[PDB]
Amino acid sequence: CTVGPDYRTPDTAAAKIDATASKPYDRSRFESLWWKQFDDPTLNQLVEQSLSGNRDLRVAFARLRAARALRDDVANDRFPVVTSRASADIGKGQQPGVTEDRVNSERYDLGLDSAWELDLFGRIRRQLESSDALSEAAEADLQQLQVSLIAELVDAYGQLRGAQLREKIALSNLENQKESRQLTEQLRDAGVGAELDVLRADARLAATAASVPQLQAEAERARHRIATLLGQRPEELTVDLSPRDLPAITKALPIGDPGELLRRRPDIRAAERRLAASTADVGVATADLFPRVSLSGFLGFTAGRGSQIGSSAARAWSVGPSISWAAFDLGSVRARLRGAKADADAALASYEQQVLLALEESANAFSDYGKRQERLVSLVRQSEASRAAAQQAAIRYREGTTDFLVLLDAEREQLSAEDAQAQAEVELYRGIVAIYRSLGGGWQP
Amino acid sequence: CTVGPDYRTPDTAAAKIDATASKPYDRSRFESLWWKQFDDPTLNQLVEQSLSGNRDLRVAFARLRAARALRDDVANDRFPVVTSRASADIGKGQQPGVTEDRVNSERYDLGLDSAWELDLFGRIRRQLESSDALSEAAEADLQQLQVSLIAELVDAYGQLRGAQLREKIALSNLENQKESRQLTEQLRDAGVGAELDVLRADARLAATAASVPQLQAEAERARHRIATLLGQRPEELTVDLSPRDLPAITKALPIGDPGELLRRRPDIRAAERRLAASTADVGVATADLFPRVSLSGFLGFTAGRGSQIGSSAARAWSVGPSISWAAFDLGSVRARLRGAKADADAALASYEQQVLLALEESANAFSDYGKRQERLVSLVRQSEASRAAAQQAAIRYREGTTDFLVLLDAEREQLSAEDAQAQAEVELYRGIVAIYRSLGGGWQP
Amino acid sequence: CTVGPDYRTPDTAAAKIDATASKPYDRSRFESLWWKQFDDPTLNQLVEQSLSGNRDLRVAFARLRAARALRDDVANDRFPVVTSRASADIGKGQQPGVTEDRVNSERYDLGLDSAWELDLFGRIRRQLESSDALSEAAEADLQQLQVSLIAELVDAYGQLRGAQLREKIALSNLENQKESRQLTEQLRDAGVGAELDVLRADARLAATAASVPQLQAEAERARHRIATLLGQRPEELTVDLSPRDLPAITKALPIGDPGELLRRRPDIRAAERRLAASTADVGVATADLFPRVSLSGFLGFTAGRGSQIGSSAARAWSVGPSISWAAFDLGSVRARLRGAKADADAALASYEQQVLLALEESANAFSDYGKRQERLVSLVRQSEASRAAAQQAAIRYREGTTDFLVLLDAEREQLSAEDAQAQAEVELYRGIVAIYRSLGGGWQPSAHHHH
Ligand SMILES: CCCCCCCCO[C@@H]1O[C@H](CO)[C@@H](O)[C@H](O)[C@H]1O
Ligand SMILES: CCCCCCCCO[C@@H]1O[C@H](CO)[C@@H](O)[C@H](O)[C@H]1O
Ligand SMILES: CCCCCCCCO[C@@H]1O[C@H](CO)[C@@H](O)[C@H](O)[C@H]1O
Ligand SMILES: [Cl-]
Ligand code: NA
């Protein structure tokens, strides 16, 4: 008898994402070490350091150890608990029933105490089933944290490279705008120009120069996130983060069969294990509806005179079988069973919410990424056309055939176009991170 | 007797919102089913389905069931607790007081055990007062969750419509700009234009084209959000969410008396019930300064020989009145009572914080909504003037009385004004959501 | 004897912020009342009201009271627990090993019951040590809340002044825009202008006018945050928030020595205290490897007849010494010890995480502050050049020597540059707030002899 419900994993349908039978994706294989596809040795080294150094990941390993330990304690309860004891009871007073004289009472005991719950309705088995499930939930929390940390770290490296790239674009445009300002001064100083042109050229220059330390500020915050993610102090970063291009993936993304994502994601597995544990805890409570059968025991020495402890004349053994049942207090037991039942329903609903959220995340990740590819195509044209316009406009302002606002406006748009394209490239990179995060890549899978 | 403080609900003054005596608002009625004023049957359907499907709401129902179960367990402690038992003590050794010969010894017992706490100072009455209040707190948490879920979902629908409206504005402006690009080519080719016009028109068209998939991406995210809020997978959502106009409310908003808002909001009642519970708990702890009167009992059979259990010559009864009092351990009792007073002071301050947060949310929503109405008036005027500007610039550019930049800039401003007016209409719809969430609209009794 | 590990504070190296040996910072002093340097008596009153009224600070202080009361209860376990009792056992049945007759049975007891765990391996001393350290983690949680709340309140005052500043600038740019609209109309009606000029000037006015109620909305939301942070209802604010300038500190920033920052941060002390409690808890579990020794007792009266209770004839006493040891259940004691040790690893690891997060907030605050100063320099220039361009473009438009677009564009850049400058001024103010928050400003570390 192991009473209560026997847990079965819910019959959860595979994820279905149609968007993935398309050019951008390769369903034939899944890459577990998904970040290496960027081909960036600096990134690969950040990730390896993270996995040895991160303090959140280290808390999660410790919690996994703690959970195993809880389990190990509970598993002993299937066996008699045999402890040691030496005690005495000594006093003087009446002894009602026997005498109204005040007489000396002495008693000495030395030996083994035994306590055993016979697990006839599986109360104890259910407890262990529960702790086993909680131990596996802790393993899966640890794996999720790994998935989460790697995505966060790869993502922050993206933001660093982005700030760097945008800084480079700001300073490149700042030189075009300085050339323009210098031309407005030259034409003004040769008597064929205007202060108005110079003032507008100064203002635009100053706007562009203002963007530079803001972008450097962002890059620094990203260096500092990266250091914390690595388990390192900000000034102690080992890995060199001097600018390099934003990484890129050429090939179609190896995403495997999107219908395996719910099986691969550890957060799903962790919530499924919590549901398993909770379901076993209904069994624990269900056992209290039935009688409890216990078996106490003593083996050693009992004596009225302390001097005899240890001798054959004081040998003693005792056995204490006991059956308890709640009887008229079954109402209380039923209340606790309803408690355990409500908690298992909370756990199932919570499991289902995790599934739903996981499907929401992957549906977003794939929807975003398709759309971000399309957007980038339009941004690349915008940048090419902008540049060509700003070049033509600079020529014509020099030659006297267009007003300064034509060159100013064309310069503003070139900056705006180039910067927007960079941001869109960063988004694509981060969209890749989001896809692999939502698929549960990076724990070993 | 019932020791400790008698709980009284704090005398919290009514919310006062002076800005509600304006024209935007109707204080003569409150609509509970506040979203139905949008007259959007698709919205109505979404809300009804989320009330049966949402999984966070299912979790809260189950938490309520858990709390009622704790309360039911406590309620039985008012009465003698009567369990059943069959035990035996079997052994061989000395029997101190009686003999030093190692003898066989047997005791059998079978019957009913009684444990009764007389509760003369109302310790148990107070325990039940606390558990009852907490069941009510769990019921209020459930209702605050409905309020928050319905606001979240109405708001997401708004965002979905917003992105659909903005995609529509972007595509409409994309056509105007495509007509402009074709005009620059045509005039260039006919010999009265310039490559510099065409390049610039190419860049702006691409910029507008680029916005379209970003808007579409956002529409897809809001759709996936709605699906999870309904308790559905993204691909199972059957509700037809193809574009419709952003809903609007043309009559003054029925907001009722804003002095009722603190009584309506379930968050406030949940924090009030937690306060009532912690106050009962002070009662529990205060009761331990006084003696505890109890009464134990046995009714059944007691025998020296297993043979006799069940027979008349083994009938036994037993009664154990007991009075205990902490005496020199009152330091420990006083320490717990201080603990309980501190907890009740936390719960009081936390209730006041919730009140002040509710008034803040409420003050923001009204202040926001008034300003978003005024702001929209100016944006409507901006959009009108801009369309007329763009219209005229296009006539003037075709005719040869203005330069391409004038037309380019007027089209930029048209898009920018139109898009901004759209975002402001979306803000207004969300302003209405914020108002009703802040008044505690939309929960079931 | 006290068993298990003896806690030593980690040897945590000092923070090193190279960037702070610079002209913007004065490392010779630290002001713990860091907001007073803005020399803004309105702000100073907000802060004092907040400290009297804020409800979250009351919650945290009440949690600290409860933690100390818990610690006081655990402290009593080092001594005999002596309770009092009056009782009886009355019945009818057999009495095994005595008679098989159903006899009447009566018994009365009255006196003191005593229970004592003799704390020979320090189980109870370690419990008290854990519970004291958790007390301390609660004083420090409260102190970290106060640092956070002060920073949040000062930051919100800044946003409020920001929003008032930007509304002033929008309104001022609106007046220039209206003068320009008037001119497009005159030039039109005098046969030397264009309807297209009037139309674009109207679109621009409406755009600028649109921004005003949004800035007012922002300012209202800041007033309302301020009120909740003071423990006040939104319409009952006691401090007048009518527009004033965003405060400034011209003096170089008194930041002390950056290698003192980890000692000044209460969030660090809290996490360190939880690590100390958790290490004590290893001790608690270690003590269960060893025997437990107890002494029970009774002193009072025992009798078979009720009337005799209280008299000499019925005096009574007993003593009940005891020693147990887990023996064959040692594997359980060991599982719990492995568990306690795992929890201590977890705590050391959170303590270190908190240190790293504290160094990241500090690095970011100093980094941002420096960059924000540089940026403001360029934005001040933008504003100066834009204002002058717009003045000139107006002269030129009036002359018949530009399309209106030259003026319209110069007026947008003037508003856009001034507004950006005001935003950057707000961001510098908020950067100051982020520096002080990261350094653990806003509480008194020297109080209570530190510990
Ligand atoms: C009237 C005299 C009776 C004589 C009885 C002798 C009791 C011996 O006494 C016992 O001796 C043992 C070693 O032999 C010890 O281990 C015991 O602890 C001790 O109490
Ligand atoms: C077991 C014998 C019964 C002893 C009962 C003594 C009754 C105690 O009496 C109570 O003691 C408290 C002292 O802290 C006070 O707060 C109460 O006001 C007082 O009435
Ligand atoms: C660990 C021993 C606990 C001592 C109780 C101290 C009670 C008050 O604690 C004080 O609260 C203030 C805010 O209310 C903080 O500014 C102080 O730094 C803090 O010590
Ligand atoms: Cl982190
Ligand atoms: Na009960």
PDB file of N, CA, C and O in Angstrom, chain A residues 55 62 65 72-73 76 82 84-86 88 90-92 94 100 102 196 204 210 216 221 224-225 228 233 412, chain C residues 13-14 305 313 315 317-321 323-326 328 332 338 345 352 360 364 368 371 375 409 413:
ATOM      1  N   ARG A  55      28.695  33.758  -9.501  1.00  0.00           N
ATOM      2  CA  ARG A  55      28.213  33.462  -8.121  1.00  0.00           C
ATOM      3  C   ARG A  55      26.760  33.004  -8.037  1.00  0.00           C
ATOM      4  O   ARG A  55      26.437  32.244  -7.144  1.00  0.00           O
ATOM      5  N   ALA A  62      24.907  24.962  -4.815  1.00  0.00           N
ATOM      6  CA  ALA A  62      24.782  24.741  -3.386  1.00  0.00           C
ATOM      7  C   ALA A  62      23.356  24.319  -3.011  1.00  0.00           C
ATOM      8  O   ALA A  62      23.159  23.438  -2.162  1.00  0.00           O
ATOM      9  N   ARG A  65      22.965  20.768  -3.751  1.00  0.00           N
ATOM     10  CA  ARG A  65      23.521  19.938  -2.648  1.00  0.00           C
ATOM     11  C   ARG A  65      22.594  19.843  -1.424  1.00  0.00           C
ATOM     12  O   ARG A  65      22.446  18.778  -0.808  1.00  0.00           O
ATOM     13  N   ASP A  72      18.344  12.646   1.480  1.00  0.00           N
ATOM     14  CA  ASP A  72      19.099  11.592   2.196  1.00  0.00           C
ATOM     15  C   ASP A  72      18.546  11.387   3.631  1.00  0.00           C
ATOM     16  O   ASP A  72      18.320  10.248   4.054  1.00  0.00           O
ATOM     17  N   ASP A  73      18.168  12.468   4.312  1.00  0.00           N
ATOM     18  CA  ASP A  73      17.577  12.336   5.666  1.00  0.00           C
ATOM     19  C   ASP A  73      16.240  11.602   5.674  1.00  0.00           C
ATOM     20  O   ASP A  73      16.020  10.690   6.478  1.00  0.00           O
ATOM     21  N   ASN A  76      16.179   7.605   5.320  1.00  0.00           N
ATOM     22  CA  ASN A  76      16.391   6.831   6.548  1.00  0.00           C
ATOM     23  C   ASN A  76      15.147   6.449   7.267  1.00  0.00           C
ATOM     24  O   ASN A  76      15.137   5.444   7.954  1.00  0.00           O
ATOM     25  N   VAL A  82      17.458   3.891  15.555  1.00  0.00           N
ATOM     26  CA  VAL A  82      18.049   3.307  16.771  1.00  0.00           C
ATOM     27  C   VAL A  82      19.076   4.228  17.386  1.00  0.00           C
ATOM     28  O   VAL A  82      20.163   4.394  16.846  1.00  0.00           O
ATOM     29  N   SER A  84      20.873   5.838  21.314  1.00  0.00           N
ATOM     30  CA  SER A  84      21.473   5.481  22.613  1.00  0.00           C
ATOM     31  C   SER A  84      20.884   6.327  23.676  1.00  0.00           C
ATOM     32  O   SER A  84      20.573   7.490  23.425  1.00  0.00           O
ATOM     33  N   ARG A  85      20.824   5.801  24.894  1.00  0.00           N
ATOM     34  CA  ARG A  85      20.393   6.591  26.042  1.00  0.00           C
ATOM     35  C   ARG A  85      20.817   5.993  27.384  1.00  0.00           C
ATOM     36  O   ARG A  85      20.727   4.798  27.603  1.00  0.00           O
ATOM     37  N   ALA A  86      21.223   6.861  28.292  1.00  0.00           N
ATOM     38  CA  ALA A  86      21.430   6.539  29.679  1.00  0.00           C
ATOM     39  C   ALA A  86      20.616   7.569  30.454  1.00  0.00           C
ATOM     40  O   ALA A  86      20.822   8.774  30.291  1.00  0.00           O
ATOM     41  N   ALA A  88      18.178   8.339  34.345  1.00  0.00           N
ATOM     42  CA  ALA A  88      17.687   8.028  35.677  1.00  0.00           C
ATOM     43  C   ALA A  88      16.507   8.902  36.042  1.00  0.00           C
ATOM     44  O   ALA A  88      16.393  10.045  35.579  1.00  0.00           O
ATOM     45  N   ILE A  90      14.988   9.820  39.948  1.00  0.00           N
ATOM     46  CA  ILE A  90      15.315   9.714  41.379  1.00  0.00           C
ATOM     47  C   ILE A  90      14.495  10.755  42.095  1.00  0.00           C
ATOM     48  O   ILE A  90      14.545  11.904  41.694  1.00  0.00           O
ATOM     49  N   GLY A  91      13.793  10.393  43.170  1.00  0.00           N
ATOM     50  CA  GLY A  91      13.032  11.367  43.953  1.00  0.00           C
ATOM     51  C   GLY A  91      12.532  10.808  45.263  1.00  0.00           C
ATOM     52  O   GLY A  91      12.851   9.692  45.659  1.00  0.00           O
ATOM     53  N   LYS A  92      11.709  11.583  45.928  1.00  0.00           N
ATOM     54  CA  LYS A  92      11.112  11.150  47.174  1.00  0.00           C
ATOM     55  C   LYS A  92       9.759  11.796  47.265  1.00  0.00           C
ATOM     56  O   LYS A  92       9.631  12.998  47.042  1.00  0.00           O
ATOM     57  N   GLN A  94       5.196  10.698  48.224  1.00  0.00           N
ATOM     58  CA  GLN A  94       4.181   9.660  48.227  1.00  0.00           C
ATOM     59  C   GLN A  94       4.105   8.948  46.891  1.00  0.00           C
ATOM     60  O   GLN A  94       4.743   9.331  45.916  1.00  0.00           O
ATOM     61  N   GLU A 100       0.944   6.432  51.469  1.00  0.00           N
ATOM     62  CA  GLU A 100       1.021   7.859  51.829  1.00  0.00           C
ATOM     63  C   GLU A 100       2.267   8.226  52.648  1.00  0.00           C
ATOM     64  O   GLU A 100       2.427   9.375  53.072  1.00  0.00           O
ATOM     65  N   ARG A 102       6.146   9.186  52.480  1.00  0.00           N
ATOM     66  CA  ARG A 102       7.139   9.677  51.544  1.00  0.00           C
ATOM     67  C   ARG A 102       8.351   8.741  51.490  1.00  0.00           C
ATOM     68  O   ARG A 102       9.158   8.711  52.419  1.00  0.00           O
ATOM     69  N   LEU A 196      24.985  82.289 -40.870  1.00  0.00           N
ATOM     70  CA  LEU A 196      23.873  81.392 -40.651  1.00  0.00           C
ATOM     71  C   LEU A 196      24.241  79.911 -40.966  1.00  0.00           C
ATOM     72  O   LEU A 196      23.759  79.017 -40.273  1.00  0.00           O
ATOM     73  N   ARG A 204      24.929  71.192 -35.344  1.00  0.00           N
ATOM     74  CA  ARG A 204      24.852  69.833 -35.715  1.00  0.00           C
ATOM     75  C   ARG A 204      26.104  69.008 -35.250  1.00  0.00           C
ATOM     76  O   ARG A 204      25.974  67.883 -34.737  1.00  0.00           O
ATOM     77  N   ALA A 210      27.917  65.245 -28.790  1.00  0.00           N
ATOM     78  CA  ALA A 210      27.219  64.872 -27.561  1.00  0.00           C
ATOM     79  C   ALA A 210      26.875  63.401 -27.522  1.00  0.00           C
ATOM     80  O   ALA A 210      26.789  62.847 -26.448  1.00  0.00           O
ATOM     81  N   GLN A 216      29.819  55.741 -25.182  1.00  0.00           N
ATOM     82  CA  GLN A 216      30.954  55.224 -24.377  1.00  0.00           C
ATOM     83  C   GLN A 216      30.432  54.880 -22.995  1.00  0.00           C
ATOM     84  O   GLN A 216      30.834  53.905 -22.462  1.00  0.00           O
ATOM     85  N   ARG A 221      29.075  50.407 -19.058  1.00  0.00           N
ATOM     86  CA  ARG A 221      28.090  49.690 -18.279  1.00  0.00           C
ATOM     87  C   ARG A 221      28.035  48.234 -18.755  1.00  0.00           C
ATOM     88  O   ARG A 221      27.913  47.356 -17.919  1.00  0.00           O
ATOM     89  N   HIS A 224      31.011  46.373 -17.384  1.00  0.00           N
ATOM     90  CA  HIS A 224      30.802  46.079 -16.002  1.00  0.00           C
ATOM     91  C   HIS A 224      29.772  44.923 -15.703  1.00  0.00           C
ATOM     92  O   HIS A 224      29.975  44.161 -14.753  1.00  0.00           O
ATOM     93  N   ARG A 225      28.679  44.829 -16.474  1.00  0.00           N
ATOM     94  CA  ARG A 225      27.730  43.726 -16.406  1.00  0.00           C
ATOM     95  C   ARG A 225      28.534  42.445 -16.691  1.00  0.00           C
ATOM     96  O   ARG A 225      28.389  41.460 -15.989  1.00  0.00           O
ATOM     97  N   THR A 228      30.659  41.373 -13.739  1.00  0.00           N
ATOM     98  CA  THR A 228      29.833  40.695 -12.731  1.00  0.00           C
ATOM     99  C   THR A 228      29.358  39.304 -13.198  1.00  0.00           C
ATOM    100  O   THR A 228      29.490  38.375 -12.449  1.00  0.00           O
ATOM    101  N   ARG A 233      35.488  41.340 -10.477  1.00  0.00           N
ATOM    102  CA  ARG A 233      35.470  42.741 -10.188  1.00  0.00           C
ATOM    103  C   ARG A 233      35.698  43.558 -11.464  1.00  0.00           C
ATOM    104  O   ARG A 233      36.442  43.122 -12.368  1.00  0.00           O
ATOM    105  N   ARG A 412      22.349  64.885 -41.612  1.00  0.00           N
ATOM    106  CA  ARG A 412      21.613  64.383 -40.490  1.00  0.00           C
ATOM    107  C   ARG A 412      21.066  62.976 -40.811  1.00  0.00           C
ATOM    108  O   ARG A 412      21.134  62.113 -39.989  1.00  0.00           O
TER     109      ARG A 412
ATOM    110  N   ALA C  13      38.768  42.305  -0.368  1.00  0.00           N
ATOM    111  CA  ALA C  13      39.622  43.421  -0.714  1.00  0.00           C
ATOM    112  C   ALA C  13      38.762  44.700  -0.941  1.00  0.00           C
ATOM    113  O   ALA C  13      37.553  44.640  -1.326  1.00  0.00           O
ATOM    114  N   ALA C  14      39.400  45.824  -0.656  1.00  0.00           N
ATOM    115  CA  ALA C  14      38.834  47.148  -0.814  1.00  0.00           C
ATOM    116  C   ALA C  14      38.465  47.465  -2.268  1.00  0.00           C
ATOM    117  O   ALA C  14      39.110  47.016  -3.206  1.00  0.00           O
ATOM    118  N   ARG C 305      -4.807  11.974  48.136  1.00  0.00           N
ATOM    119  CA  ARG C 305      -6.018  12.643  48.609  1.00  0.00           C
ATOM    120  C   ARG C 305      -5.829  14.141  48.412  1.00  0.00           C
ATOM    121  O   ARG C 305      -4.782  14.685  48.783  1.00  0.00           O
ATOM    122  N   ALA C 313       3.297  16.477  54.779  1.00  0.00           N
ATOM    123  CA  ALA C 313       3.201  15.028  54.565  1.00  0.00           C
ATOM    124  C   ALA C 313       3.323  14.652  53.067  1.00  0.00           C
ATOM    125  O   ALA C 313       3.863  13.591  52.755  1.00  0.00           O
ATOM    126  N   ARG C 315       4.952  16.673  50.560  1.00  0.00           N
ATOM    127  CA  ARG C 315       6.132  17.208  49.865  1.00  0.00           C
ATOM    128  C   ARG C 315       6.647  16.180  48.868  1.00  0.00           C
ATOM    129  O   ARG C 315       6.483  14.976  49.080  1.00  0.00           O
ATOM    130  N   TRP C 317       9.636  15.642  45.326  1.00  0.00           N
ATOM    131  CA  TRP C 317      10.610  16.098  44.400  1.00  0.00           C
ATOM    132  C   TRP C 317      11.097  14.955  43.565  1.00  0.00           C
ATOM    133  O   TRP C 317      10.976  13.799  43.935  1.00  0.00           O
ATOM    134  N   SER C 318      11.614  15.290  42.401  1.00  0.00           N
ATOM    135  CA  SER C 318      12.335  14.338  41.594  1.00  0.00           C
ATOM    136  C   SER C 318      13.224  15.074  40.599  1.00  0.00           C
ATOM    137  O   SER C 318      13.025  16.263  40.307  1.00  0.00           O
ATOM    138  N   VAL C 319      14.217  14.342  40.120  1.00  0.00           N
ATOM    139  CA  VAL C 319      15.259  14.816  39.243  1.00  0.00           C
ATOM    140  C   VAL C 319      15.361  13.746  38.146  1.00  0.00           C
ATOM    141  O   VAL C 319      15.092  12.601  38.393  1.00  0.00           O
ATOM    142  N   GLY C 320      15.690  14.133  36.918  1.00  0.00           N
ATOM    143  CA  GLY C 320      15.565  13.245  35.739  1.00  0.00           C
ATOM    144  C   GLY C 320      16.697  13.499  34.748  1.00  0.00           C
ATOM    145  O   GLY C 320      16.470  14.030  33.672  1.00  0.00           O
ATOM    146  N   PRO C 321      17.945  13.156  35.131  1.00  0.00           N
ATOM    147  CA  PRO C 321      19.084  13.325  34.236  1.00  0.00           C
ATOM    148  C   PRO C 321      19.061  12.340  33.091  1.00  0.00           C
ATOM    149  O   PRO C 321      18.466  11.279  33.192  1.00  0.00           O
ATOM    150  N   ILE C 323      20.962  11.389  28.949  1.00  0.00           N
ATOM    151  CA  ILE C 323      21.943  11.580  27.937  1.00  0.00           C
ATOM    152  C   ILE C 323      21.556  10.661  26.792  1.00  0.00           C
ATOM    153  O   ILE C 323      21.287   9.470  27.011  1.00  0.00           O
ATOM    154  N   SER C 324      21.414  11.241  25.601  1.00  0.00           N
ATOM    155  CA  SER C 324      21.163  10.451  24.412  1.00  0.00           C
ATOM    156  C   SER C 324      22.195  10.758  23.364  1.00  0.00           C
ATOM    157  O   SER C 324      22.918  11.725  23.457  1.00  0.00           O
ATOM    158  N   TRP C 325      22.302   9.867  22.404  1.00  0.00           N
ATOM    159  CA  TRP C 325      23.252  10.016  21.333  1.00  0.00           C
ATOM    160  C   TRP C 325      22.669   9.313  20.129  1.00  0.00           C
ATOM    161  O   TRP C 325      22.026   8.246  20.288  1.00  0.00           O
ATOM    162  N   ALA C 326      22.837   9.907  18.940  1.00  0.00           N
ATOM    163  CA  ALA C 326      22.111   9.424  17.746  1.00  0.00           C
ATOM    164  C   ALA C 326      22.454   7.982  17.342  1.00  0.00           C
ATOM    165  O   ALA C 326      21.630   7.301  16.729  1.00  0.00           O
ATOM    166  N   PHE C 328      23.017   4.731  15.717  1.00  0.00           N
ATOM    167  CA  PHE C 328      22.778   4.165  14.393  1.00  0.00           C
ATOM    168  C   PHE C 328      21.975   5.141  13.476  1.00  0.00           C
ATOM    169  O   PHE C 328      21.850   4.865  12.320  1.00  0.00           O
ATOM    170  N   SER C 332      21.501  10.174   9.454  1.00  0.00           N
ATOM    171  CA  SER C 332      20.565  11.324   9.423  1.00  0.00           C
ATOM    172  C   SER C 332      21.175  12.652   9.855  1.00  0.00           C
ATOM    173  O   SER C 332      20.952  13.736   9.193  1.00  0.00           O
ATOM    174  N   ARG C 338      25.509  17.919   6.125  1.00  0.00           N
ATOM    175  CA  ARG C 338      25.818  18.217   4.709  1.00  0.00           C
ATOM    176  C   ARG C 338      24.905  19.346   4.192  1.00  0.00           C
ATOM    177  O   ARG C 338      25.343  20.171   3.408  1.00  0.00           O
ATOM    178  N   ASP C 345      27.764  27.410   1.987  1.00  0.00           N
ATOM    179  CA  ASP C 345      28.341  27.713   0.682  1.00  0.00           C
ATOM    180  C   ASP C 345      27.461  28.692  -0.101  1.00  0.00           C
ATOM    181  O   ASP C 345      27.999  29.607  -0.765  1.00  0.00           O
ATOM    182  N   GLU C 352      29.416  37.208  -1.782  1.00  0.00           N
ATOM    183  CA  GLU C 352      30.350  37.651  -2.854  1.00  0.00           C
ATOM    184  C   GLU C 352      29.611  38.288  -4.025  1.00  0.00           C
ATOM    185  O   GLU C 352      30.111  39.239  -4.637  1.00  0.00           O
ATOM    186  N   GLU C 360      29.870  46.920  -9.266  1.00  0.00           N
ATOM    187  CA  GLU C 360      29.314  47.281 -10.560  1.00  0.00           C
ATOM    188  C   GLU C 360      28.483  48.602 -10.470  1.00  0.00           C
ATOM    189  O   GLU C 360      28.648  49.461 -11.304  1.00  0.00           O
ATOM    190  N   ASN C 364      29.622  51.948 -12.444  1.00  0.00           N
ATOM    191  CA  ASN C 364      28.699  52.541 -13.399  1.00  0.00           C
ATOM    192  C   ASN C 364      28.407  53.997 -13.005  1.00  0.00           C
ATOM    193  O   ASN C 364      28.296  54.843 -13.847  1.00  0.00           O
ATOM    194  N   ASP C 368      29.320  56.865 -15.668  1.00  0.00           N
ATOM    195  CA  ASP C 368      28.238  57.654 -16.175  1.00  0.00           C
ATOM    196  C   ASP C 368      28.443  59.153 -15.824  1.00  0.00           C
ATOM    197  O   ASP C 368      28.190  60.027 -16.649  1.00  0.00           O
ATOM    198  N   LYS C 371      31.021  60.883 -18.082  1.00  0.00           N
ATOM    199  CA  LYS C 371      30.516  60.974 -19.458  1.00  0.00           C
ATOM    200  C   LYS C 371      29.384  62.012 -19.568  1.00  0.00           C
ATOM    201  O   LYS C 371      29.316  62.773 -20.536  1.00  0.00           O
ATOM    202  N   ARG C 375      29.195  65.277 -22.004  1.00  0.00           N
ATOM    203  CA  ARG C 375      28.104  65.413 -22.931  1.00  0.00           C
ATOM    204  C   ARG C 375      27.403  66.803 -22.805  1.00  0.00           C
ATOM    205  O   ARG C 375      27.005  67.408 -23.812  1.00  0.00           O
ATOM    206  N   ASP C 409      13.154  74.942 -39.619  1.00  0.00           N
ATOM    207  CA  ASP C 409      14.167  74.009 -39.214  1.00  0.00           C
ATOM    208  C   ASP C 409      15.072  74.539 -38.113  1.00  0.00           C
ATOM    209  O   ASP C 409      15.436  73.794 -37.197  1.00  0.00           O
ATOM    210  N   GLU C 413      15.359  72.864 -34.239  1.00  0.00           N
ATOM    211  CA  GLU C 413      16.660  72.599 -33.636  1.00  0.00           C
ATOM    212  C   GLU C 413      16.867  73.412 -32.365  1.00  0.00           C
ATOM    213  O   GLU C 413      17.425  72.886 -31.398  1.00  0.00           O
TER     214      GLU C 413
END
